[PDB]
Amino acid sequence: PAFEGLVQRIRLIVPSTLRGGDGEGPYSPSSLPSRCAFQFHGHDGSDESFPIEYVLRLMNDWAEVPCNPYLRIQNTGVSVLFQGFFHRPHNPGGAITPERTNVILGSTETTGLSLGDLDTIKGRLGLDARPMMASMWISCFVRMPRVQLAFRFMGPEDA
């Protein structure tokens, strides 16, 4: 019953345009699966942002056992696919750095990022480490046969 609440929360965070929710089983905060926790996808022509940091942090918060949450982004050929993991899969560590926020994916192509690498990059940058003062989003422009990704740290407006 807990995992439903988690994925419901995450679903609330992710925009409605990106279709998804719970991904492709049942698990406790004690035991984490290798299979993806949640799945979201966007059709051709869409411009959608994904709150990657917030979601990964939510997953890491939910788990009672140490783990390094991982978001996997794929260009399937017909859409963009965001999949959530508690542990990155074997054989996609991250091609993103403070010097390169852009990643362009051809058909059947995968990229991804972990919360540890995300925190490392955020640390490399002189951005605010305090909660909600800096949260990374993935700017996604779906233009088949390609998908454009921009991993950008966004800040509050407080206005």
Partner 1 sequence: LHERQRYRGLFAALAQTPSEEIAIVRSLSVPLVKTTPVSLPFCLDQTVADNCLTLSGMGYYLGIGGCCPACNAGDGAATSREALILAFVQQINTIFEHRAFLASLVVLADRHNAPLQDLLAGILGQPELFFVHTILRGGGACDPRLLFYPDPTYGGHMLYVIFPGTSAHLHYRLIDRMLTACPGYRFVAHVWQSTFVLVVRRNAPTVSAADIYCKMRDISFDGGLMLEYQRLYATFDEFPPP
User: Does 124 sit near partner 1 (CB under 8 A)?
Assistant: no
The answer to whether residue 68 forms part of the interface with partner 1 (CB under 8 A) is yes
Q: Which of 3, 27, 137, 141 binds Cl ion (CB under 5 A)?
A: 141
Candidates 7-15, 23-31, 116-124, 139-147 — which segment interacts with Cl ion by CB under 5 A?
Answer: 139-147
Q: Which is nearer to Cl ion, 38 or 86 (CB)?
A: 38
Considering the complex, what minimum distance in angstroms separates the CB of residue 74 from partner 1? 17
- Contact between 8 and 57 under an 8 Å Cβ cutoff? The reply is no
CA distances from 156 to 12, 65, 67, 84, 130 (A): 19, 31, 28, 25, 12
Measured CA to CA, the distance from residue 71 to residue 158 in angstroms comes to 28
Choose, by CB under 8 A, the member of 3, 23, 46, 101 that binds partner 1.
101
**Breaks in the chain listed by the residue before each, with C–N > 2.5 Å:** 24, 91
**Among the listed residues 3, 9, 27, 43, the single contact to partner 1 using CB under 8 A:** 9
DSSP 33-76: -SS-SEEEEE-TT-EEEE-HHHHHHHHHHH-SS--B-EEEEEE-
Q: Which amino acid is at 8?
A: Q
Helix (H, G, I), strand (E, B) or coil at 50: strand
Q: Which of 16, 25, 30, 158 binds partner 1 (CB under 8 A)?
A: 158
The residues binding partner 1 (CB under 8 A) are 9, 12-13, 47, 51, 54, 57-58, 60-61, 66, 68-69, 99-102, 104, 115-116, 119, 125, 127, 129-132, 134-135, 137, 139, 141, 143, 148-150, 152-158
